Coordinates of C-alpha atoms and ligand atoms in Angstrom, one line a residue:
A1 CA -45.7 38.2 38.6
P2 CA -47.9 36.1 36.2
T3 CA -48.7 32.4 36.5
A4 CA -45.7 30.1 35.8
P5 CA -45.9 28.4 32.4
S6 CA -46.8 24.7 32.4
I7 CA -45.3 22.7 29.5
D8 CA -47.7 20.8 27.3
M9 CA -45.6 17.7 26.6
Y10 CA -47.7 16.2 23.8
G11 CA -48.1 19.6 22.1
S12 CA -44.3 20.0 22.2
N13 CA -43.5 16.6 20.6
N14 CA -42.5 15.2 24.0
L15 CA -39.6 17.7 23.7
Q16 CA -37.8 15.6 21.1
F17 CA -36.4 17.5 18.1
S18 CA -33.8 16.7 15.4
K19 CA -31.5 18.5 12.9
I20 CA -31.8 15.4 10.7
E21 CA -34.9 13.8 9.1
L22 CA -34.3 10.1 8.3
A23 CA -36.8 7.8 6.6
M24 CA -37.2 4.7 8.8
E25 CA -40.1 2.7 7.3
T26 CA -39.3 3.1 3.5
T27 CA -36.4 2.8 1.1
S28 CA -35.8 5.4 -1.6
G29 CA -33.2 7.8 -3.1
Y30 CA -30.5 9.2 -0.7
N31 CA -31.8 12.8 -1.0
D32 CA -35.3 11.6 -0.5
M33 CA -34.4 9.6 2.6
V34 CA -31.9 12.0 4.2
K35 CA -32.7 15.7 5.0
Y36 CA -30.2 17.6 7.0
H37 CA -30.9 21.1 8.5
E38 CA -28.3 23.5 9.9
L39 CA -31.0 24.7 12.3
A40 CA -33.6 22.5 14.1
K41 CA -37.1 23.8 14.1
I42 CA -38.2 23.9 17.7
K43 CA -41.9 24.1 18.7
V44 CA -42.9 24.1 22.4
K45 CA -46.4 24.7 23.7
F46 CA -47.2 25.8 27.3
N47 CA -50.3 26.5 29.3
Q48 CA -51.4 29.0 32.0
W49 CA -54.9 27.8 32.9
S50 CA -55.3 30.0 36.1
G51 CA -54.4 33.5 37.0
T52 CA -52.7 36.1 34.7
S53 CA -50.9 34.7 31.7
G54 CA -48.7 37.8 31.4
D55 CA -47.4 39.6 28.3
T56 CA -44.0 38.1 27.3
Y57 CA -42.3 34.7 27.4
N58 CA -38.6 33.7 27.5
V59 CA -37.2 30.3 26.7
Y60 CA -34.0 29.2 28.4
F61 CA -31.6 26.4 27.7
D62 CA -29.3 25.8 30.7
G63 CA -30.0 29.4 31.8
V64 CA -29.2 30.9 28.4
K65 CA -32.0 32.6 26.6
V66 CA -32.8 31.0 23.2
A67 CA -36.2 32.4 22.4
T68 CA -38.7 35.2 23.3
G69 CA -42.1 36.3 22.1
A70 CA -45.6 37.4 23.1
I71 CA -48.2 35.7 25.4
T72 CA -51.9 35.8 24.5
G73 CA -54.5 33.9 26.5
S74 CA -54.1 30.7 28.4
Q75 CA -52.4 28.8 25.5
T76 CA -49.0 29.8 23.9
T77 CA -46.9 28.2 21.2
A78 CA -43.2 29.0 21.1
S79 CA -41.6 28.5 17.7
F80 CA -37.9 29.0 17.1
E81 CA -34.8 27.6 15.6
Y82 CA -31.7 26.1 17.3
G83 CA -28.5 24.8 15.7
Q84 CA -26.6 22.9 18.5
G85 CA -27.4 19.3 19.3
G86 CA -27.5 18.0 22.8
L87 CA -29.6 17.7 26.0
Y88 CA -30.6 21.0 27.6
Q89 CA -32.5 22.0 30.8
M90 CA -35.4 24.0 29.4
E91 CA -37.2 26.6 31.4
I92 CA -40.0 28.8 30.1
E93 CA -40.5 32.2 31.8
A94 CA -43.6 34.4 31.7
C95 CA -43.2 38.1 32.4
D96 CA -45.3 41.2 32.9
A97 CA -44.9 44.7 34.6
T98 CA -44.9 43.2 38.1
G99 CA -42.3 40.4 37.5
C100 CA -41.4 37.0 36.0
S101 CA -42.2 33.4 36.8
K102 CA -40.5 30.3 35.5
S103 CA -41.6 26.8 34.8
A104 CA -39.9 23.8 36.4
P105 CA -36.9 22.7 34.4
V106 CA -37.4 19.9 32.0
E107 CA -35.0 18.2 29.5
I108 CA -35.3 19.0 25.8
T109 CA -33.5 16.8 23.3
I110 CA -32.1 18.2 20.1
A111 CA -30.6 15.4 17.9
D112 CA -27.5 15.9 15.8
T113 CA -25.2 13.6 13.9
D114 CA -22.3 14.3 16.3
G115 CA -24.1 12.2 18.9
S116 CA -24.3 15.1 21.3
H117 CA -27.8 14.1 22.3
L118 CA -26.7 10.5 23.0
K119 CA -25.1 8.9 26.1
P120 CA -21.8 7.2 25.6
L121 CA -22.1 3.6 24.1
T122 CA -22.1 0.6 26.4
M123 CA -19.9 -2.1 25.0
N124 CA -20.2 -5.9 24.5
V125 CA -16.6 -6.8 23.7
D126 CA -15.2 -10.4 23.7
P127 CA -13.0 -10.5 26.9
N128 CA -10.3 -12.1 24.9
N129 CA -9.5 -8.6 23.8
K130 CA -6.8 -7.5 26.3
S131 CA -6.1 -4.1 27.9
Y132 CA -3.0 -2.2 26.7
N133 CA -1.0 1.0 27.4
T134 CA 0.1 1.6 23.7
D135 CA 1.3 5.1 22.8
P136 CA -1.8 7.0 21.5
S137 CA 0.4 8.5 18.7
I138 CA 0.8 5.0 17.2
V139 CA -1.9 4.2 14.6
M140 CA -4.0 1.1 15.5
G141 CA -6.7 0.9 12.8
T142 CA -9.3 -1.5 11.6
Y143 CA -12.2 -1.8 9.1
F144 CA -15.8 -2.2 10.4
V145 CA -18.0 -3.4 7.5
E146 CA -21.6 -2.2 7.1
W147 CA -22.9 -5.6 6.1
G148 CA -21.3 -7.3 9.1
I149 CA -24.5 -6.9 11.2
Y150 CA -26.2 -9.6 9.1
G151 CA -24.8 -13.2 8.9
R152 CA -21.6 -12.2 10.6
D153 CA -23.7 -10.8 13.5
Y154 CA -21.0 -8.3 14.4
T155 CA -22.2 -4.9 15.7
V156 CA -20.5 -1.6 16.7
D157 CA -20.7 -2.4 20.4
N158 CA -18.6 -5.5 19.8
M159 CA -15.6 -3.5 18.7
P160 CA -12.6 -3.4 21.1
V161 CA -12.6 0.4 20.8
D162 CA -10.1 1.1 23.6
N163 CA -7.6 -0.9 21.4
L164 CA -8.2 1.3 18.3
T165 CA -7.2 4.7 17.1
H166 CA -9.0 4.5 13.8
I167 CA -12.2 2.8 12.6
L168 CA -12.5 2.8 8.8
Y169 CA -16.2 2.2 7.9
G170 CA -16.6 0.2 4.6
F171 CA -18.0 1.0 2.3
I172 CA -19.5 4.2 0.9
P173 CA -20.5 3.9 -2.8
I174 CA -20.3 6.6 -5.6
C175 CA -23.2 6.9 -7.9
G176 CA -22.4 6.1 -11.6
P177 CA -20.9 3.1 -13.4
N178 CA -20.9 0.2 -11.0
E179 CA -21.0 -3.0 -13.0
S180 CA -18.5 -4.6 -10.5
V181 CA -21.2 -4.5 -7.8
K182 CA -23.1 -7.3 -9.6
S183 CA -20.4 -9.8 -8.6
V184 CA -21.5 -9.4 -5.0
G185 CA -25.1 -10.6 -5.6
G186 CA -27.5 -10.3 -2.7
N187 CA -29.4 -7.6 -4.8
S188 CA -26.6 -5.1 -4.1
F189 CA -26.7 -3.6 -7.6
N190 CA -30.4 -2.8 -7.4
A191 CA -29.9 -1.4 -3.9
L192 CA -27.3 1.0 -5.2
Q193 CA -29.6 2.0 -8.1
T194 CA -32.4 2.8 -5.6
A195 CA -30.0 4.9 -3.4
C196 CA -28.8 6.8 -6.5
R197 CA -32.3 7.8 -7.7
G198 CA -32.3 11.6 -7.4
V199 CA -28.5 11.7 -7.0
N200 CA -26.1 12.9 -9.7
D201 CA -23.3 10.6 -10.9
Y202 CA -20.1 10.9 -8.9
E203 CA -21.9 11.9 -5.7
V204 CA -21.7 9.6 -2.6
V205 CA -24.6 7.8 -1.1
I206 CA -25.3 5.2 1.7
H207 CA -25.5 1.7 0.2
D208 CA -27.6 0.1 3.0
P209 CA -29.8 2.7 4.8
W210 CA -31.3 -0.1 7.0
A211 CA -27.8 -1.1 8.4
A212 CA -26.6 2.5 8.4
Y213 CA -29.4 4.4 10.2
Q214 CA -32.7 2.5 10.4
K215 CA -32.0 -0.7 12.3
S216 CA -33.2 -0.7 15.9
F217 CA -30.4 -1.8 18.3
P218 CA -31.6 -2.5 21.9
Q219 CA -28.0 -2.2 23.2
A220 CA -28.2 1.5 22.1
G221 CA -31.7 2.2 23.5
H222 CA -33.3 2.5 20.0
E223 CA -37.1 2.8 19.8
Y224 CA -39.7 3.8 17.3
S225 CA -39.3 7.5 17.8
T226 CA -35.5 7.5 17.8
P227 CA -34.5 10.0 15.0
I228 CA -31.2 8.2 14.3
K229 CA -30.7 4.4 14.6
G230 CA -28.5 1.7 12.9
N231 CA -24.7 1.5 12.9
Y232 CA -24.4 5.3 12.5
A233 CA -26.2 6.1 15.8
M234 CA -24.0 3.6 17.5
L235 CA -20.9 5.2 16.0
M236 CA -22.1 8.6 17.2
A237 CA -22.4 7.2 20.7
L238 CA -19.0 5.6 20.4
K239 CA -17.5 9.1 19.7
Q240 CA -19.1 10.2 23.0
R241 CA -17.4 7.3 24.8
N242 CA -14.0 7.6 23.2
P243 CA -13.5 11.3 22.2
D244 CA -10.0 10.7 20.7
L245 CA -11.1 7.9 18.4
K246 CA -11.1 8.6 14.7
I247 CA -14.0 7.3 12.6
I248 CA -13.5 7.7 8.9
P249 CA -15.8 6.6 6.0
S250 CA -14.0 4.4 3.4
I251 CA -15.2 5.3 -0.1
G252 CA -14.9 2.6 -2.7
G253 CA -13.3 -0.8 -2.1
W254 CA -13.0 -3.7 -4.5
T255 CA -16.6 -3.7 -5.8
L256 CA -17.3 0.0 -5.6
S257 CA -14.2 1.5 -7.4
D258 CA -15.7 1.7 -10.9
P259 CA -16.6 5.5 -10.8
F260 CA -13.0 6.4 -9.8
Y261 CA -11.8 5.7 -13.3
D262 CA -13.8 8.7 -14.5
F263 CA -11.9 11.1 -12.2
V264 CA -9.5 11.8 -15.1
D265 CA -12.1 14.5 -15.8
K266 CA -11.8 17.2 -13.1
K267 CA -15.6 18.0 -13.4
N268 CA -16.3 14.6 -12.0
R269 CA -13.8 15.2 -9.1
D270 CA -15.5 18.5 -8.4
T271 CA -18.9 16.8 -8.1
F272 CA -17.4 14.1 -5.8
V273 CA -15.5 16.5 -3.6
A274 CA -18.6 18.7 -3.1
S275 CA -20.7 15.6 -2.2
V276 CA -18.1 14.5 0.3
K277 CA -18.2 17.9 2.0
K278 CA -22.0 17.6 2.2
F279 CA -21.7 14.1 3.5
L280 CA -19.3 15.2 6.3
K281 CA -21.6 18.1 7.3
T282 CA -24.6 15.7 7.4
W283 CA -22.7 13.0 9.3
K284 CA -20.7 14.9 11.9
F285 CA -19.3 11.8 13.7
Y286 CA -17.0 11.2 10.7
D287 CA -13.5 12.6 11.1
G288 CA -12.3 12.8 7.5
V289 CA -12.3 10.7 4.4
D290 CA -10.6 7.5 3.2
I291 CA -10.2 6.8 -0.5
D292 CA -10.1 3.1 -1.4
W293 CA -9.6 3.1 -5.2
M294 CA -8.7 -0.4 -6.5
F295 CA -6.8 0.5 -8.5
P296 CA -5.3 3.5 -10.3
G297 CA -4.0 2.1 -13.6
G298 CA -6.4 -0.9 -13.4
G299 CA -6.1 -4.5 -12.3
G300 CA -9.3 -4.2 -10.1
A301 CA -12.7 -5.7 -10.4
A302 CA -13.4 -4.0 -13.8
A303 CA -11.1 -5.7 -16.4
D304 CA -12.1 -3.1 -19.0
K305 CA -10.9 -0.1 -16.9
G306 CA -7.6 1.5 -15.9
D307 CA -5.5 4.3 -17.4
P308 CA -1.8 4.1 -16.5
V309 CA -1.1 7.6 -17.9
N310 CA -3.9 9.5 -16.3
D311 CA -5.1 7.6 -13.2
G312 CA -2.2 8.5 -10.9
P313 CA -2.3 12.2 -11.8
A314 CA -6.1 12.1 -11.1
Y315 CA -5.5 10.4 -7.8
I316 CA -3.0 13.1 -6.8
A317 CA -5.3 15.9 -8.0
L318 CA -8.2 14.3 -6.0
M319 CA -6.1 14.3 -2.8
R320 CA -5.1 18.0 -3.4
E321 CA -8.7 18.9 -4.0
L322 CA -10.0 16.8 -1.0
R323 CA -7.4 18.5 1.2
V324 CA -8.6 22.0 0.1
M325 CA -12.2 20.9 0.9
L326 CA -11.2 19.5 4.3
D327 CA -9.4 22.8 5.1
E328 CA -12.7 24.6 4.4
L329 CA -14.4 22.3 6.9
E330 CA -11.6 22.9 9.4
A331 CA -12.1 26.7 9.1
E332 CA -15.9 26.4 9.4
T333 CA -15.9 24.0 12.4
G334 CA -12.6 24.4 14.2
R335 CA -12.1 20.6 14.0
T336 CA -9.3 18.6 12.5
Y337 CA -10.0 16.4 9.5
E338 CA -7.9 13.5 8.2
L339 CA -7.4 12.4 4.6
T340 CA -6.3 8.8 4.0
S341 CA -6.3 6.0 1.4
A342 CA -6.0 2.3 1.4
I343 CA -3.7 1.2 -1.5
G344 CA -2.5 -1.9 -3.2
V345 CA 1.1 -2.8 -2.6
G346 CA 1.8 -5.0 -5.7
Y347 CA 4.6 -3.4 -7.7
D348 CA 2.2 -3.1 -10.6
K349 CA -0.2 -1.1 -8.6
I350 CA 2.3 1.2 -6.7
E351 CA 4.0 2.1 -10.0
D352 CA 0.9 3.9 -11.4
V353 CA 0.9 6.6 -8.7
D354 CA 3.5 9.2 -7.6
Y355 CA 2.7 8.7 -3.9
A356 CA 5.4 11.2 -2.9
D357 CA 3.3 13.8 -4.6
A358 CA 0.0 12.5 -3.3
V359 CA 1.0 12.0 0.3
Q360 CA 1.9 15.7 0.9
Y361 CA -1.9 16.2 1.2
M362 CA -2.5 13.1 3.2
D363 CA -2.3 12.0 6.9
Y364 CA -1.9 8.3 6.3
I365 CA -1.6 5.6 3.6
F366 CA -3.1 2.3 4.7
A367 CA -0.8 -0.2 2.9
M368 CA -2.9 -3.2 2.0
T369 CA -0.2 -5.7 2.7
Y370 CA -2.3 -8.8 2.2
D371 CA -4.1 -10.7 -0.7
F372 CA -0.6 -11.5 -2.1
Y373 CA -1.8 -15.1 -3.0
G374 CA -5.3 -16.6 -2.9
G375 CA -8.0 -18.8 -4.3
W376 CA -8.3 -16.8 -7.6
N377 CA -5.8 -19.4 -8.9
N378 CA -4.3 -22.7 -7.8
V379 CA -0.9 -21.4 -6.8
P380 CA -0.1 -21.5 -3.0
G381 CA 1.8 -18.7 -1.3
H382 CA 1.8 -16.5 1.8
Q383 CA -1.1 -14.0 1.4
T384 CA 0.2 -11.5 3.9
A385 CA 3.9 -12.3 4.6
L386 CA 6.4 -9.7 5.6
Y387 CA 9.2 -11.2 3.4
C388 CA 9.8 -13.6 0.5
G389 CA 9.0 -17.2 1.5
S390 CA 11.1 -20.3 1.2
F391 CA 8.8 -21.5 -1.7
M392 CA 10.0 -18.7 -3.9
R393 CA 12.7 -19.4 -6.6
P394 CA 16.1 -17.7 -6.4
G395 CA 15.6 -14.3 -8.1
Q396 CA 11.8 -14.3 -7.6
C397 CA 11.9 -12.1 -4.5
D398 CA 13.6 -9.1 -6.2
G399 CA 12.1 -10.0 -9.6
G400 CA 15.4 -10.4 -11.4
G401 CA 15.1 -14.1 -11.9
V402 CA 13.1 -16.5 -14.1
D403 CA 9.9 -18.6 -13.6
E404 CA 9.1 -22.2 -14.6
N405 CA 8.6 -21.4 -18.3
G406 CA 11.9 -19.5 -18.5
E407 CA 10.0 -16.2 -18.6
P408 CA 11.6 -13.4 -16.5
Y409 CA 9.6 -12.0 -13.5
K410 CA 8.1 -8.6 -14.3
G411 CA 8.6 -7.2 -10.9
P412 CA 9.4 -7.9 -7.2
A413 CA 7.3 -10.7 -5.6
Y414 CA 4.2 -9.8 -3.7
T415 CA 5.3 -9.3 0.0
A416 CA 4.7 -6.6 2.6
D417 CA 8.4 -5.5 2.7
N418 CA 8.6 -5.3 -1.1
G419 CA 5.5 -3.0 -1.2
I420 CA 6.8 -0.8 1.7
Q421 CA 10.2 -0.5 0.2
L422 CA 8.7 0.6 -3.2
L423 CA 6.7 3.3 -1.4
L424 CA 9.8 4.5 0.5
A425 CA 11.8 4.5 -2.8
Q426 CA 9.2 7.0 -4.2
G427 CA 10.0 9.4 -1.3
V428 CA 6.9 8.6 0.9
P429 CA 7.8 9.2 4.5
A430 CA 7.7 6.1 6.7
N431 CA 5.7 7.9 9.4
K432 CA 2.7 8.2 7.1
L433 CA 2.7 4.5 6.2
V434 CA 0.4 2.1 8.1
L435 CA 1.2 -1.6 7.8
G436 CA -1.6 -4.0 7.0
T437 CA -2.4 -7.1 9.1
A438 CA -4.9 -9.8 8.1
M439 CA -7.7 -11.0 10.3
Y440 CA -8.6 -13.6 7.7
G441 CA -7.0 -16.5 5.8
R442 CA -7.1 -17.3 2.1
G443 CA -7.1 -21.0 1.2
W444 CA -7.1 -23.9 -1.2
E445 CA -8.0 -27.6 -1.3
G446 CA -6.2 -30.4 -3.1
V447 CA -2.7 -29.4 -2.1
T448 CA -1.8 -33.0 -1.2
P449 CA 1.8 -34.1 -0.4
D450 CA 2.3 -35.5 -3.9
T451 CA 1.9 -32.1 -5.5
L452 CA 4.8 -30.6 -3.5
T453 CA 8.2 -30.2 -4.9
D454 CA 9.5 -29.7 -1.3
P455 CA 7.6 -32.3 0.7
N456 CA 7.6 -30.3 4.0
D457 CA 6.6 -27.0 2.5
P458 CA 3.0 -27.1 1.3
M459 CA 3.6 -23.7 -0.4
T460 CA 5.5 -25.6 -3.1
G461 CA 2.4 -27.6 -3.9
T462 CA -0.5 -27.1 -6.3
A463 CA -4.2 -26.7 -5.5
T464 CA -7.3 -28.3 -7.2
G465 CA -9.6 -25.4 -6.1
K466 CA -10.6 -22.9 -3.4
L467 CA -11.1 -23.7 0.3
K468 CA -14.7 -24.7 0.9
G469 CA -16.9 -24.7 4.0
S470 CA -19.7 -23.3 6.1
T471 CA -20.2 -19.8 7.5
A472 CA -20.2 -21.5 10.9
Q473 CA -16.5 -22.1 10.3
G474 CA -16.0 -18.5 9.1
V475 CA -16.1 -19.3 5.4
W476 CA -18.3 -16.5 3.9
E477 CA -16.9 -17.0 0.4
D478 CA -14.9 -19.9 -1.1
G479 CA -11.2 -19.5 -0.5
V480 CA -11.6 -17.0 2.4
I481 CA -11.9 -17.7 6.1
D482 CA -12.2 -15.6 9.3
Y483 CA -9.2 -15.8 11.6
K484 CA -11.5 -16.7 14.4
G485 CA -12.7 -19.6 12.2
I486 CA -9.2 -20.8 11.7
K487 CA -8.5 -20.7 15.4
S488 CA -11.7 -22.5 16.3
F489 CA -11.6 -25.2 13.6
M490 CA -8.0 -25.7 12.4
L491 CA -5.6 -24.4 15.1
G492 CA -7.3 -25.4 18.4
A493 CA -6.6 -24.2 21.9
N494 CA -2.8 -24.6 21.7
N495 CA -2.2 -23.8 18.0
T496 CA -1.1 -27.4 17.5
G497 CA -3.7 -28.2 14.8
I498 CA -7.0 -30.0 15.0
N499 CA -9.4 -31.8 12.7
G500 CA -6.6 -33.2 10.5
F501 CA -4.8 -29.9 10.2
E502 CA -1.2 -29.2 11.1
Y503 CA 0.4 -25.8 12.0
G504 CA 3.5 -24.6 10.2
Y505 CA 5.5 -21.3 10.1
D506 CA 7.9 -19.9 7.5
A507 CA 10.5 -18.0 9.6
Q508 CA 12.0 -16.5 6.4
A509 CA 8.7 -15.0 5.3
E510 CA 7.3 -14.5 8.8
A511 CA 4.1 -16.3 7.8
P512 CA 1.9 -19.0 9.4
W513 CA -0.2 -21.7 7.7
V514 CA -2.4 -24.7 8.5
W515 CA -2.3 -27.7 6.3
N516 CA -4.5 -30.8 6.2
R517 CA -2.5 -33.5 4.3
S518 CA -5.5 -35.7 3.7
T519 CA -7.8 -33.1 2.1
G520 CA -5.0 -31.0 0.7
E521 CA -6.6 -28.0 2.5
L522 CA -4.1 -25.2 3.0
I523 CA -4.7 -21.8 4.6
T524 CA -2.4 -18.7 4.7
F525 CA -3.1 -16.1 7.3
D526 CA -1.7 -13.8 10.1
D527 CA -1.2 -15.3 13.6
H528 CA 0.3 -14.1 16.9
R529 CA 3.9 -14.7 15.7
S530 CA 3.6 -13.0 12.3
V531 CA 1.8 -10.0 13.7
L532 CA 4.4 -9.7 16.4
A533 CA 7.0 -9.7 13.5
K534 CA 4.9 -7.0 11.7
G535 CA 4.8 -4.8 14.9
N536 CA 8.5 -5.1 15.4
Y537 CA 9.1 -4.4 11.7
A538 CA 6.8 -1.3 11.9
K539 CA 8.7 0.0 15.0
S540 CA 12.2 -0.6 13.3
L541 CA 11.2 1.4 10.2
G542 CA 9.4 4.1 12.1
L543 CA 6.1 3.4 10.4
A544 CA 2.9 5.2 11.5
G545 CA 1.5 2.0 13.0
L546 CA -0.7 -0.9 12.0
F547 CA -4.2 -1.5 10.6
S548 CA -6.4 -4.5 9.9
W549 CA -9.2 -6.0 7.8
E550 CA -11.7 -6.9 9.1
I551 CA -12.5 -6.6 12.9
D552 CA -15.5 -8.9 12.8
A553 CA -13.2 -11.8 11.8
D554 CA -10.9 -11.4 14.8
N555 CA -11.5 -13.1 18.2
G556 CA -9.1 -10.7 19.9
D557 CA -5.8 -12.6 19.1
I558 CA -4.9 -10.4 16.1
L559 CA -5.6 -7.0 17.6
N560 CA -3.9 -8.2 20.8
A561 CA -0.7 -9.2 18.8
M562 CA -0.9 -5.8 17.0
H563 CA -0.5 -4.0 20.3
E564 CA 2.0 -6.5 21.7
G565 CA 4.1 -6.1 18.6
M566 CA 4.2 -2.3 18.9
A567 CA 5.1 -2.5 22.7
Ligands
LIG1 C1 -1.3 -7.7 -4.2 C2 -2.4 -7.8 -5.2 O1 -2.3 -7.0 -6.2 N1 -3.3 -8.7 -5.1 C3 -4.5 -8.8 -5.9 C4 -5.7 -9.1 -5.0 O2 -6.0 -7.9 -4.3 C5 -6.9 -9.6 -5.9 O3 -7.8 -10.2 -5.0 C6 -9.0 -9.4 -4.7 O4 -8.7 -8.8 -3.4 C7 -9.7 -7.9 -3.0 C8 -9.3 -7.2 -1.7 O5 -9.2 -8.1 -0.6 C9 -11.0 -8.6 -2.8 O6 -12.0 -7.7 -2.5 C10 -13.0 -8.1 -1.5 O7 -14.0 -8.8 -2.2 C11 -15.0 -9.3 -1.3 C12 -16.0 -10.1 -2.2 O8 -15.3 -11.0 -3.0 C13 -15.7 -8.2 -0.6 O9 -16.6 -8.7 0.4 C14 -18.0 -8.4 0.0 O10 -18.4 -7.1 0.0 C15 -19.7 -6.9 -0.5 C16 -19.9 -5.4 -0.8 O11 -19.1 -5.0 -1.8 C17 -20.6 -7.6 0.5 O12 -22.1 -7.4 0.2 C18 -20.4 -9.1 0.4 O13 -21.3 -9.7 1.4 C19 -18.9 -9.3 0.8 N2 -18.5 -10.7 0.6 C20 -17.8 -11.4 1.5 C21 -17.3 -12.7 1.1 O14 -17.6 -11.0 2.7 C22 -14.7 -7.3 0.1 O15 -15.4 -6.1 0.6 C23 -13.5 -6.9 -0.8 N3 -12.5 -6.3 0.1 C24 -12.1 -5.0 -0.1 C25 -10.9 -4.6 0.7 O16 -12.7 -4.2 -0.8 C26 -11.4 -9.4 -4.0 O17 -12.5 -10.3 -3.7 C27 -10.2 -10.2 -4.6 N4 -10.6 -10.7 -5.9 C28 -10.8 -12.0 -6.2 C29 -11.1 -12.4 -7.6 O18 -10.7 -12.9 -5.3 C30 -6.5 -10.7 -6.9 C31 -7.6 -11.1 -7.8 O19 -8.1 -10.0 -8.5 O20 -5.4 -10.2 -7.7 C32 -4.2 -9.9 -6.9 O21 -3.2 -9.6 -7.8

């Protein structure tokens, strides 16, 4: 037998290889920054500085032969390709006529976007998040936002993953018309332009590559040489920790829906669908696709867009086409992929789509049963109520009555049940509907007692403007506040109200509020009681389960109540 091969670690790139190349120190176009390979190029060097080198080598991964070639001289380079990610015990064998000798086993790392090379993620979850034995068949979803790692300081390892079936990752942009992005500020439009350089219109990209895959997280063991970092590497590790968990990219959202309006042309859908397939092959930790178009027929961020004739049919066609594409992926991989959508529940949004048609291709509809009322005007109301509140006029709930000016209502009032019933009325099965819970409040100021028509219902008052405050109190935008902020600064330990605020609950609507009489500050949100009511409602109707926006804003109370309501 010849001399046993000795691995040259430096000449073998410390045995670290990757199926994906990701730019870490620059920012450029998506296709410039991200290069995915179906086969990793492996290059291992070994030495035989004494005795006979032999004639032939064999490379083994966990005892399975993966390469073979010739040995010449004391130095040998073994170049081959390998397509499965993970950690393998590598042995290199040298053979001649007299026999074979093997190197000592050493670990080789081949990175892939399924996280197979990564150890399961260690968590840092707020202990206020409780442990539950909820039926795994019940949907328990939430949104994790890409930008939450900044001011909100909320990272993947903070998620109460044991209390979730679905993580929706917001948001994936589509290259093309995106004027609505400018309303965000923070240089987000320019960031999108950069990402889209070298990318065709209607193809998906990553908006924030720093957050997505570049940022080094010490809790995930990231270092300079780590081939995948950021939120994505952490989500990959999360898949290893919780194998039954579904992680789904959310495409669009309020600010990134503009390109959807061009899906009336099938050519644009074709381009999009193909890009999504590429995206799911590149990022293997993702378990499907979620479409967040706000909204078919219009009424979204872009006032100049919306086609009530063609948008709904395009939406249905998109779902059909996405399902065909996902079926291709299922055939190629043996995996199961999910197709979902978050949708508006206002009567004027629901009416623009035949969801009975669309839903045949879909696993779930995430019914966005919030944002019913808010700081966009000075009219108080329950933003996420199950039913019509006491503040509503007779006939307002169903929409058959008349407003202040004598003008008839144009449709049923904005409530969760009104939305759900409209979807059911179309023929959508209840077991595909997921009910939305809010982990945030919307709010006003100047709703002082004198503005109220009913003195002990602040929802009958009138605002002077939006709720204002600091990010310390969870106010990231005027008129919007994190639930955990409401709890910390308005509710207090026993939900009795602090800092001039009082707690109230509309039993008719199933909706809480906090009201400061002196400042006129009023906040509408979901709390333990209303979320219990939502869970009991979801069970009674046989809905698929519950979902929420956004997990960073919860302190545990809301997700806790979601589980307790579905018990
Ligand atoms: C029932 C019904 O039809 N109601 C309508 C309301 O939906 C509508 O109010 C609008 O509601 C959407 C959904 O909640 C909301 O969209 C959110 O917008 C914020 C910014 O305002 C986004 O958060 C930002 O995201 C960017 C990236 O895009 C981040 O960089 C930025 O840091 C984030 N800013 C903050 C403060 O966190 C959210 O991502 C986005 N949510 C979703 C789900 O996409 C709009 O803001 C609401 N519009 C207004 C004007 O308030 C209402 C008004 O149009 O009309 C009702 O009829």
